RNA sequence: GUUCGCGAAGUAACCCUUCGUGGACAUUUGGUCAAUUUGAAACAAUACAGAGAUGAUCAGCAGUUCCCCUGCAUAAGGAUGAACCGUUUUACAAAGAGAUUUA
């Protein structure tokens, strides 16, 4: 269960944010598998953005 | 048909009856509409499917329309009622550069 971040799913994210915008995360974890709302937005705001 | 009155005849004795005539009484309904095929109900059945916002499953209010339906309704429902989701070129110019033609 313990995961780490491929730049694959990371890129799919930044594309997703680049569409749906930040605060719709529950959709951004739909495209993205393996991952959750709080996980997505956690790494986003704390790192990727 | 009633009544008033006149005349005539008969009965009669100023009437009872019959005939004729004058007068009054009484005075214009209804239709926007013909009687089943060809001057207009709408459902149902067959087939085709089989519920907006989303990646997905639902609550919903609205907004516009030469669409309306149910409801006493200025209530509220009818898939949040349905239709919307499509097609998309000119107030048009200014500066610069090359090719062509001409005074
Ligand atoms: Mg309504
Ligand atoms: Mg619904
Ligand atoms: Mg409506």
CA of A30 vs C1' of B91, distance in Å? 50
Q: Which residues contact A35 (CB under 8 A, 6 or more apart)?
A: A3, A9, A29
* Ligand 3 centroid from CA A20, angstroms: 28
Distance CA A23, CA A4 (A): 23
Q: Which A residues between 8 and 47 have a beta carbon under 7 A from any strand B atom?
A: 20, 26-27, 30-31
Distance CA A8, CA A24 (A): 21
Nucleotides of B under 7 A from a protein CB: 54-56
CA of A35 vs C1' of B27, distance in Å? 107
This structure's resolution (Å) is: 4.0
Distance CA A44, CA A21 (A): 12
């Amino acid at each position: 269960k313990g995961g780490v971040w491929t730049n694959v799913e990371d890129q799919i994210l930044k594309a997703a944010v680049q569409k749906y915008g930040t605060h719709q995360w529950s959709k951004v974890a739909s495209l993205l598998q393996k991952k959750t709302a709080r996980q997505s937005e956690l790494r986003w705001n704390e790192y990727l953005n």
